[PDB]
Amino acid sequence: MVISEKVRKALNDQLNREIYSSYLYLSMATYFDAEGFKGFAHWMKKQAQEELTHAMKFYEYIYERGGRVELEAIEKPPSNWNGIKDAFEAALKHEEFVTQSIYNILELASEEKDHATVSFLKWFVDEQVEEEDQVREILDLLEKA
């Protein structure tokens, strides 16, 4: 393995966080569909699939560095929200937690002088920041102020 175990575990943790992200967006879709919001459910379904490509990017990086992936149990997500804005605000809050979690790994890899992982994570935060901004675009679009 050409990464430290500490970094491997953090990346594996993050991969599992991307999986939970995908499941949370699917659960938001079950809520939107239960309320009849077909189009917003479809947005959530495509976002759930986008989250799986995030998990597979971490998957591929870990094996490239000689690590292995270990899948953990997935927590039951919430199944109800109080309207569209309420669901998308919960997603914004979740993606901000995800963005900070990735910045934490990048700090760790930087302290270890793990240049390859620093490069990987620097590239990925740019995609995470735009996925967060996609959530903000919806909230701004519905801002019925």
Added chain:
Amino acid sequence: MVISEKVRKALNDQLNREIYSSYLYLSMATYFDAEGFKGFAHWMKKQAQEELTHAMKFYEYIYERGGRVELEAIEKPPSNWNGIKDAFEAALKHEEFVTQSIYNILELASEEKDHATVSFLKWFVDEQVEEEDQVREILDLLEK
């Protein structure tokens, strides 16, 4: 809702079982990849994606009948096997469990005289049976 609650819950149980199927196959891929078995990992990754379309078919049927889907926690799958055959035999046994679970929902829908759900499950079980036979084909290919 034009299905009974016990039927909706059985279909919802099955949906979550398909999710766990997808996760198990991804876990087998993490094992195959750690062993360097790249082509078999790719098989498992495709199969995991196939399992998500199974989940979404139960998803679509539940809402069509006026029900709702509730996602449950997914249990941690095993992460290690003792070789290729060992992993695929585990997959076969899981798919045989899945096949019997679908047959049990069929018996329940048929005693309720839920003709729409009986039709749905007869259609789907044919797909489940070919996915089972896909696993058997790999085991037969690797035999002895």
